[PDB]
Amino acid sequence: MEKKFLDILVCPVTKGRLEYHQDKQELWSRQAKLAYPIKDGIPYMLENEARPLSEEELKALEHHHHHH
């Protein structure tokens, strides 16, 4: 039942849902068109460290990615 516990990650502005993927530890947001970096549990939603997503990536947010 351990969801909505650590699974409450949302954007600081749009406050929409986020799903993380390992390897790069990136948070993808279509609602913000950005991607946030995670440093071992330290999300950097900072202007300097937050990077935009490409259209491809944006388009690949039509559904959950690597959730299954």
Side-chain angles (χ1 to χ4, degrees), residues 3-18:
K3 46 174 50 187
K4 293 177 175 180
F5 288 94
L6 78 171
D7 178 59
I8 48 178
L9 302 178
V10 291
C11 309
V13 185
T14 49
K15 299 182 182 183
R17 254 290 183 154
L18 295 175

Side-chain angles (χ1 to χ4, degrees), residues 27-45:
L27 295 173
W28 277 13
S29 57
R30 188 259 171 112
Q31 60 271 29
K33 300 184 62 167
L34 303 173
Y36 307 109
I38 292 282
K39 190 177 186 296
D40 199 67
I42 302 299
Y44 283 120
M45 62 287 292

Side-chain angles (χ1 to χ4, degrees), residues 38-66:
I38 292 282
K39 190 177 186 296
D40 199 67
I42 302 299
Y44 283 120
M45 62 287 292
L46 303 182
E47 310 309 293
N48 185 269
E49 299 176 85
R51 44 283 201 131
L53 284 176
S54 50
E55 275 192 278
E56 192 215 326
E57 296 174 300
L58 297 176
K59 278 178 298 187
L61 293 172
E62 179 185 75
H63 59 86
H64 296 299
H65 54 86
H66 196 74

